[PDB]
Design a protein around this ligand. Structure first.
Ligand SMILES: C/C1=C\[C@H](C)C[C@H](C)OC(=O)C[C@H](c2ccc(O)cc2)NC(=O)[C@@H](Cc2c(Br)[nH]c3ccccc23)N(C)C(=O)[C@H](C)NC(=O)[C@@H](C)C1
Ligand SMILES: C/C1=C\[C@H](C)C[C@H](C)OC(=O)C[C@H](c2ccc(O)cc2)NC(=O)[C@@H](Cc2c(Br)[nH]c3ccccc23)N(C)C(=O)[C@H](C)NC(=O)[C@@H](C)C1
Ligand SMILES: C/C1=C\[C@H](C)C[C@H](C)OC(=O)C[C@H](c2ccc(O)cc2)NC(=O)[C@@H](Cc2c(Br)[nH]c3ccccc23)N(C)C(=O)[C@H](C)NC(=O)[C@@H](C)C1
Ligand SMILES: Nc1ncnc2c1ncn2[C@@H]1O[C@H](COP(=O)(O)OP(=O)(O)O)[C@@H](O)[C@H]1O
Ligand SMILES: Nc1ncnc2c1ncn2[C@@H]1O[C@H](COP(=O)(O)OP(=O)(O)O)[C@@H](O)[C@H]1O
Ligand SMILES: Nc1ncnc2c1ncn2[C@@H]1O[C@H](COP(=O)(O)OP(=O)(O)O)[C@@H](O)[C@H]1O
Ligand SMILES: [Mg+2]
Ligand SMILES: [Mg+2]
Ligand SMILES: [Mg+2]
Lengths: 372, 372, 372
């Protein structure tokens, strides 16, 4: 019985079969509902559109995200999304395959309890398991020592691991990700005379950010250069309705909020500062090994010149006798899914499943004593 | 029980049976009354002539139009016209067939209430229904996405529809149609020495307009050409009394008021401007689909070189990366009736009729909550 | 040298001298142009009418608004309006008095740059300054802590201020104001059989809205009452040509779009929702102080039963242990001008002017680093 790997993010949902090295079904996590009267009798209509079929007809729909900051807010929408994933994307009966789920660290217990209850009572899966995302990201890299910096759409967290042992007192988690960058980009576009307010406009701005953004090495010099010669960074983007929008300095002022959250109005520290403070809460012996195995993960770390900028920032904070190597592997967008698929194929893991009888005898609270 | 399709316009009335692709009874909507003393005893005379029998003996009659700008002004004349349609044209008892009626958008509620009350108390039809004309025009084309530009004799309106959902905030309606063009033609004929004042003269001018009018591609160049060489556009028309009238430039200066209502003294915008402003009030995503499904309807859109002129005007207003296709199907004069006949034959529509018992229990106000 | 206070709105222009508590020249912001041939030789005519002299002879004029949503669209018309204000309304040379201007938040930089360039090159004022409207509205109330909800003719925005410090990350701005309400009223009047299309008809509808509108406490019950007994809310309004129009339910269905923008077809949230979301983006400590200092401003907040309705809506959203007090002072129509006049008389402000030499040495870009 091949297991199912389902990574439920805040902006995207990945799903596939264990043993493969690439997810088979990746689609946005949105629920669309119509806001207009239906007049044309004779054509069938649906109450709610889930996934890509809500991203194409979004002009007449209102879109909802059922997950905010890695926490499920609406459970009916999440049930609809899981049903769509199981029966419309993979088309495999969930009553014959074990399911491996992922979750961010430092989350409420009720989230895990409700997830287990839904997975066991509605779909009636044989076995299930919940694991942390940073552990799977480290699994996907084929290492055992390093500090993992994961950053997705709702939450970014750093976790150190040394030779198979995790240090829970040095785990950090902040709520600042690509959605805040999208909002910052929307705010910056106002200064040029362009206004985006609706959800579809937000998706357009998100696509613009994903296409035309990069990280600058020296922020002050780039701002100075954006005055004497701004023509070198100008780009033209074609709106879906045929209009053309000019993107200039906003190509590098949007991601800068990752290293300076004061721009968006947040008091939380930056990314390099967070990594350094997470390293400094570990024992003095393992700091040298942690400094040389920095691993990047998530979709928000896909900008250009991210590894070099992070290395330069870390160098100014670390002792002069220390070597810093920021590992930024390709295809890190799906690193968590690859790590989960690798973990689910190990022969040793077959005795760590939460079976149906154990849940029935113990209840939804069993997920705390078994899963970490 | 086959339903009756009755399209009540401002200048013409179409009527027929559901399932056919061509109206069976098309006749003008006029009520004629004599204005001369009757002397010849022995021959029968009637107080009022309705339909074609008032168009032939119009020399001794005064003609009244009971509908102005899609609004019924005199209800007794409309009752007479409906009686003539039911008992003299189709010769089918209205007490056994459901009736499907049409109406222009953005009309007063009292019109619909009075129409329902008359159809239910006088004729005592089993079931009835009222629908918008643009929806039926889109039904007749076999599509689901597009912007419909309907233009008849009293009112011209544009309505966008996207995948079965109508956008009521983007519906436009102006009162400028073939009757205003007839008045403009009458005014233009004065400059050549010809005067038309009576109603029969108005009908003659209307026939001249329907026969010898076309739309020019370039107005200024055509006006310039109408001086150096006017003989190429000269036509001779035989008046009913045998006289000959010469029609020259007025062949293309009459319809030009559709794209420039300032000629007739109106401040309303043109047709292409109205279509563009109706497209621009929709969401940015569906504008591309609306731009490629422009549908023409009504009898006023039957001029020559109308589609090419509309396409050229729309091209200068749309973004350069957009494709515009003006759909101008033949037999679009009766497109609304064809769409209504198609709609009335669907098996799904059989549960959307306003039955007699519902009207009796609720009153004439039921037509608002059920019909759109 | 007494300064000049000039508040440039989207529908009205206020102007006066610093130190007074009431604007001296208030007039609409419209530019009128004739659309008819001039035949009577011997009487002088003007190419364009600005201000009240275009509101009286509007029957033969086409009227243009040079400001849309707080953004100047046509600069020639704005120059004409400023010239009329300086030389025809106040009759004071602008070459001897400093000028204080106002602007809505979150506006393009080019607007401010062009405004400064025009004020410094054409009129050649000694000093100038640009400030936000909500700050002046809070100045006029004699407070330092509160959330200001300004709503005029083109844009409505909310800004929180705590003890002299503004929170730019909690400032909201939406484009929904009295002009949209006028359009909604025009659409509602169609259902009774009345049609307004021209600009003068729009002004008539605006006057009707300003005279006979109020806000209902319970919308559903009012709609139910408007059926059993509609005679209690009927009013008669005399049209300028002597006709009488009956205004019934539309007295309270027009302003309802402020608390439900879905009626007019907009996806933006209501006013109470916007205020609540602007309060919830501030720090937890200052929310209690913000909840008790809600200040209303603008001309669109002049309806009846607005404060009570806003208080009732806010109560259902705030925690049960919080006290909400909506401050709705009289003469809030000119609150921004009063606040600007108070600010311009302070002895401390005399060192915050943009002098001519600084602009000459730095350019039109100086307005960004000095003015907020
Ligand atoms: C950007 C887009 C199309 C664009 C029209 C494509 C073209 C290419 O850009 C322009 O034409 C820039 C132009 C503009 C540019 C410079 C200027 O000194 C004034 C206006 N901007 C405008 O007219 C503003 C007016 C405006 C409203 Br109301 N409140 C606002 C708040 C802040 C700023 C401006 C505004 N405007 C129409 C919009 O934002 C509209 C709603 N935006 C869209 O529909 C998105 C989905 C696509
Ligand atoms: C056009 C018709 C017949 C026509 C006689 C057929 C022939 C073929 O056309 C002419 O002979 C053109 C001729 C004419 C031509 C050139 C000219 O420098 C002067 C007159 N026009 C006239 O005599 C005018 C005189 C007129 C009266 Br009074 N007020 C008017 C207001 C404006 C203009 C002119 C007038 N006239 C007799 C008419 O309009 C009559 C009432 N029209 C008809 O019965 C219609 C139903 C059919
Ligand atoms: C409201 C005004 C005067 C009024 C005549 C004053 C009087 C007091 O009201 C009436 O008589 C109501 C009456 C009417 C009432 C009930 C009814 O079942 C049918 C008509 N309405 C009409 O005749 C419509 C006809 C109409 C044209 Br075309 N398209 C329209 C689109 C929608 C609705 C109706 C129409 N009509 C003449 C107008 O709108 C004119 C253009 N409106 C004006 O000039 C304004 C500036 C002042
Ligand atoms: N090439 C790219 N450049 C910059 N940002 C990107 C790129 N690709 C994706 N993103 C951002 O990453 C986010 C997706 O992250 P993802 O890892 O899918 O989150 P989750 O963990 O919730 O699945 C998107 O919001 C997008 O803004
Ligand atoms: N071949 C044609 N060329 C130009 N105009 C025409 C032609 N046929 C009809 N018309 C105009 O169209 C009008 C009829 O439109 P119609 O669709 O019957 O209006 P309604 O919607 O009221 O029935 C007439 O007034 C006539 O002037
Ligand atoms: N007494 C009133 N009742 C309701 N609405 C009003 C009243 N007075 C003015 N208004 C509305 O307020 C608008 C004027 O707002 P104003 O503050 O002058 O805008 P601006 O900020 O552009 O100057 C007008 O469009 C009008 O519709
Ligand atoms: Mg993730
Ligand atoms: Mg028609
Ligand atoms: Mg204002």
């Amino acid at each position: 019985a091949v297991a199912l790997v389902v990574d439920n993010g805040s902006g995207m949902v990945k799903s596939g079969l264990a043993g493969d090295d690439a997810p088979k079904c990746v689609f946005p996590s949105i629920v669309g509902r119509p806001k207009m009267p239906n007049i044309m009798i004779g054509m069938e209509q649906k109450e709610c559109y889930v996934g890509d079929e809500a991203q194409n007809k979004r002009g007449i729909l209102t879109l909802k995200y059922p997950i905010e900051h890695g926490i499920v807010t609406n459970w009916d929408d999440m049930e609809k999304i899981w049903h769509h994933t199981f029966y419309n994307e993979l088309r495999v009966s969930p009553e014959e395959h074990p399911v491996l789920l992922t979750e961010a660290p430092l989350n409420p217990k009720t989230n895990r309890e409700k997830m287990t209850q839904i997975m066991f009572e509605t779909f009636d899966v044989p076995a299930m398991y919940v694991s942390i995302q940073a552990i799977l990201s480290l699994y996907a890299s084929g290492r055992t020592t390093g500090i993992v910096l994961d950053s997705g759409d709702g939450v970014s967290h750093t976790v150190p691991i040394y030779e198979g042992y995790v240090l829970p007192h040095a785990i950090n988690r902040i709520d600042m990700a690509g959605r805040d960058l999208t909002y910052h980009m929307m705010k910056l576009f106002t200064e040029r005379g362009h206004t985006f307010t609706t959800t579809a406009e937000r998706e357009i701005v998100r696509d613009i950010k994903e296409k035309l953004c990069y990280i600058a090495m020296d922020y002050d010099e780039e701002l100075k250069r954006s005055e004497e010669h701004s023509d070198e960074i100008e780009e033209i983007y074609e709106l879906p309705d045929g209009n053309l929008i000019t993107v200039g300095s906003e190509r590098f002022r949007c991601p800068e909020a990752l290293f300076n959250p004061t721009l968006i109005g947040r008091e939380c520290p930056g990314l390099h500062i967070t990594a350094y403070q997470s390293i400094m809460k570990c024992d003095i012996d393992i700091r040298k090994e942690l400094y040389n195995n920095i691993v990047l993960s998530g979709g928000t770390t896909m900008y250009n010149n991210i590894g070099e900028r992070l290395t330069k920032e870390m160098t100014n904070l670390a002792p002069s006798s220390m070597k810093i190597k920021v590992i930024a592997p390709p295809e890190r967008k799906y690193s968590v899914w690859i790590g989960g698929s690798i973990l689910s194929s190990l022969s040793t893991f077959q005795q760590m499943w939460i079976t149906k009888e154990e849940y029935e005898d113990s209840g939804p609270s069993i997920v705390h004593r078994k899963c970490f």
